[PDB]
């Protein structure tokens, strides 16, 4: 038996499906037998529900009652629905959570609360569902965290209360609910927090902060061992402090950009064995190299924007398994071995204050694939020094004081440049240099050395 | 253009929303096509955003249903659900599963 | 009656010339045919000229003498040389220029004594050249600047002291020859030079210094009206003082690129209407822009790596028919209108603390193709600010913190760059974007709404 | 190789000249050429460095020999040569030409 303009279909076995979907309703559909086992009614105008509301249908695992505009749901609305598993209430003009049309609602394991109006969490609103492990909170007007009535929610695994107006997150507003594992409060208007928030959850694996208004680095961070990613990026800190991360091991993913990061500690980035990438820009204040002992599996880094003014001797022994380096402008002078650094790919050094390529400090790089050391105060390179990189095709020296070119190894790559060394007028033919596609010159008269009088500008 | 939907191009179908719906993508072809939806239809989750609210294809091994990335509503079957990843053991803290696939 | 194994021709008039090149004489040929108008022995042999010389064929225009191993000229050598205009004495290995041997050799006006091992010049060698207007003396092994000897030629109009070892410029070192019109004193090492070395030449035009062992700036330039080139690259100067070129105006090229610069007066770059270009990067200790008055005709300028903190509105008003502006890697906040600048046709203004775009700040600039505003603070966008721009055809907006994207305009460009800006989350749609090839997008989902033409998600 | 020339390719030509001799270029079809002369020719002008010297074409307008750039050391006929540059007129301070060619 589908109702009228419906759509039926059946479930598993002879458990009938209703889709009431844009149909334009006034009210919920009368008739509509048992055996049904999910319902939906989405966009279809409904004020109030109901004169008339359907228990009854025990076998119903899931209600859909989202875009139907209604103000408030009434409290035995929902009582007769016994086996009910999954019940959307999305952008729907609620202003708050049912006070208590929600409860004692055994079986449900998602309930979707978004898009709403709702601004206001009534304590013991959630009493009683112990088996709710999905929960949408997000695109609402709520001002604080519900620490109350989110205390029987220990069942919870995934909770969002993005696109609200909190601002504050008190301590323990999350006492109970330690199952949780995915929290997100992403845009929204969080300042300041407590020393003691987090403290609850301690199986939380996922952090969502993003799009926020905080000044300072949340250091309640630390208490959450289990964390695995992490979000404050596109917020307002200016520094992170010395063991940030500490207490977070087997992080794996940090997002912090956008943020007027200033200084950076030394050790901040310690202990972190699983951390795979990293991107750094801009921070000033940062003079110094930062340490990473326990964070070898590392596969990106990139450092910028700052004034180190060197590196330290052995400093890629805490750093295997990357691929992929960029100290661009920065105060560099001297340069290390970065031999024991194998496996490197990509390399961008530009813009130091270089004034030298040693042998070794590009020795044994053999998967090494691309060399810039463009603008720098290059004036004299040892002619072994790319004597063992066969990997390498792409390379630039632009903008240095170079006279001479070195030879050995090197030949059969892809680019090469050279502009703004102007000490440099000798030849350079296309053999020992075949392969070259793309090509840069300081004079006209070189380029045609390889057949423009392929690419080559001078 | 589309019921609930503000943007519409005659190449790509939807291009924005009404207020409070979701965009679904599909590239059929090398060609993509959108359309809204007050919630996404299974494989996804629901995303919202000040600029645009959009149902994301959940890149998680063997989900069938999720909340956000990297916790799965429901598993494929044959793989058992542990805190929103999937697994054929489930620990060894004290989980155990009962007569469907649920481990506590 | 050419000599054996040359090869002899017939100049103007019945004149002979006799190329006796690349033969590796052991003397010069005894029996010459005199009608000689010019005459070349090039890489030859010659130890000495000789036991037996020829004078007496008063008519060669020009003796070359290069790449031969001599080691002392005699005086009585040329001296029936009443027609020799130019004389080559190149690639030998001379200690020093002959004492008397080219003295009152009248026609010479072309004298090229380079790639020899010259470190003396005696006073009044060049006793009697008045014709002499070329002079050659590089890649010799001199010391100073060897003022006595150098006065007789005030005929002098190009001379070459480049890559000798000379440390100092003493002053008047250079007093009458006024005639002087290029000066060559590059790849050497010059460290110091006096405060009125350069005021005897009142009409030189071009001054070489590049590759030099300069720590001061050359006050001496001063005196130097008539210079229209002059060049002290790859120095070792630290900064332009103010008002450096105040004494060169209608000065065109300026070339100073290597030095380790790190400051420049404002006012130091003033009145000099015909620069055309200038490029000064990483100059940390200006904090402020530089006044341009009374030098509007400038095509290139481009500035970067200082510290400055905004620019002056009216900085336009100095500023028509440049083209190219680049205000790079810098401390720029605030911007000014633009709009009075008009010609422009590139622009890059990355890495500043650029926060906003105004309406007005790029209207009216239809010569332009292509902006840069990559890796900035800017978090909002005046829709009509790209309004009236025509011919852009390249833009980037990349690492931006932008949430939404004007439409205004603009339609139907080439390149566009709009990474790292992830609150960029609603689509871009292919029709008012034709002719859009090389695309960058922050996420996959909007690269795919232009059919993938390249998109990097 | 060739005269005073240490290194050569068949396609480049001459690629470097003995220490003190002169490269010269020249564009045959798009291909060029080095080869080694102890002074360059008419239309060109000496250029050396500690790296290298070249010989190098006269970018002039109307002249026909020079010593460098801007600066030409002959001018061809019909035009007045003044201070390294050519004119039909040439001033007005003190110049004047004579039966010959040098204002
Ligand atoms: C802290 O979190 C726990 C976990 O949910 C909260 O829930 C639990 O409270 C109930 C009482 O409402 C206890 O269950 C009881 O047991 C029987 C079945 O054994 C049941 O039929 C009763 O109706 C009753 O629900 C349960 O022991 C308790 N769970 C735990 C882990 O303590 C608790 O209320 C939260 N409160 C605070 C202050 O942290
Ligand atoms: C929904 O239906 C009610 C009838 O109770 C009507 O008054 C209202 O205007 C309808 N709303 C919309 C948005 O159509
Ligand atoms: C050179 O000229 C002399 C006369 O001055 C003559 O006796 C001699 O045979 C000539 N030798 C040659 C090789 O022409
Ligand atoms: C070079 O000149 C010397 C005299 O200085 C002479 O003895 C020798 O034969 C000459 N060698 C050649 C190859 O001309
Ligand atoms: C050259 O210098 C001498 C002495 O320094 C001076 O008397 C003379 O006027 C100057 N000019 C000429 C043309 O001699």
């Not at chain 1, 844009?22 to 109030?48: A, C, K, R």
């Not at chain 1, 909170?137 to 220990?154: G, M, Y």
């Not at chain 1, 000044?215 to 961070?221: L, M, Q, R, Y």
């Not at chain 2, 919630?39 to 069938?64: L, Q, V």
């Amino acid at each position: 038996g589908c109702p009228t303009h419906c759509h039926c279909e059946p479930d598993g076995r002879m458990l009938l499906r209703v889709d009431c979907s844009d149909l334009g309703l006034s009210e919920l559909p009368s008739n509509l037998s048992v055996f049904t086992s999910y319902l939906d009614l989405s966009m279809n105008n409904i004020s109030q529900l109901l004169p008339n509301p359907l228990p009854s249908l025990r076998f119903l695992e899931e209600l859909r009652l989202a875009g139907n505009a209604l103000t408030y749901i009434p409290k035995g609305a929902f009582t007769g629905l016994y086996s009910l598993k999954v019940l959307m209430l999305q952008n729907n003009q609620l202003r708050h959570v049912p006070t208590e049309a929600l409860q004692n609602l055994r079986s449900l394991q998602s309930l979707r609360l978004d898009a709403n109006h709702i601004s206001y969490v009534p304590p013991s609103c959630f009493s009683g569902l112990h088996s709710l492990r999905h929960l949408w909170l997000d695109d609402n007007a709520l001002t604080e965290i519900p620490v109350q009535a989110f205390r029987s929610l220990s069942a919870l695994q995934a909770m969002t209360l993005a696109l609200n107006k909190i601002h504050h997150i008190p301590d323990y507003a999350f006492g109970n609910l330690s199952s949780l594992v995915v929290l997100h409060l992403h845009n929204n208007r969080i300042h300041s927090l407590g020393k003691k928030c987090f403290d609850g959850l301690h199986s939380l694996e996922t952090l969502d902060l993003n799009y926020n208004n905080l000044d300072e680095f949340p250091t309640a961070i630390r208490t959450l061992s289990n964390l695995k990613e992490l979000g404050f990026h596109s917020n307002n800190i200016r520094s992170i402090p010395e063991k940030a991360f500490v207490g977070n091991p087997s992080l794996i993913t940090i997002h912090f950009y956008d943020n007027p990061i200033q200084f950076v500690g030394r050790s901040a980035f310690q202990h972190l064995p699983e951390l795979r990438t990293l991107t750094l820009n801009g921070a000033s204040q940062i003079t110094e190299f930062p340490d990473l002992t326990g964070t070898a599996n590392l596969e990106s880094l990139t450092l910028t924007g700052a004034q180190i003014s060197s590196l330290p001797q052995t400093v890629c022994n805490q750093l295997p398994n990357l691929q992929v380096l960029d100290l661009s402008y920065n105060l560099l002078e001297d340069l290390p071995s970065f031999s024991v650094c194998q496996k490197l790919q990509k390399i961008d050094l530009r813009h130091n204050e270089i004034y030298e390529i040693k042998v070794d400090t590009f020795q044994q790089l053999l998967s090494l694939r691309s060399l810039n050391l463009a603008w720098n105060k290059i004036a004299i390179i040892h002619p072994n020094a790319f004597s063992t990189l066969p990997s390498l095709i792409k390379l630039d020296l632009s903008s240095n004081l170079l006279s001479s070119f070195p030879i050995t190894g090197l030949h059969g790559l892809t680019h090469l440049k050279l502009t703004g060394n102007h000490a440099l007028q000798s030849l350079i033919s296309s053999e020992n240099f075949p392969e070259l596609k793309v090509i840069e010159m300081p004079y006209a008269y070189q380029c045609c050395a390889f057949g423009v009088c392929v690419q080559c500008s001078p | 253009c589309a019921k609930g939907c503000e943007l519409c191009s005659e190449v790509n179908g939807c291009l924005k929303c009404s207020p409070k719906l979701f965009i679904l993508l599909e590239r059929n072809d090398i060609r993509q096509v959108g359309v809204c939806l007050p919630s996404c239809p299974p494989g996804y989750f629901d995303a919202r955003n000040p600029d645009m609210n959009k149902c994301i294809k959940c890149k998680i091994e063997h989900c069938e249903a999720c909340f956000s990335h990297n916790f799965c509503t429901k598993c494929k079957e044959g793989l058992y659900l542990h805190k929103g990843r999937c697994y054929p053991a489930c620990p060894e803290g004290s989980s155990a599963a009962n007569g469907t696939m649920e481990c506590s």
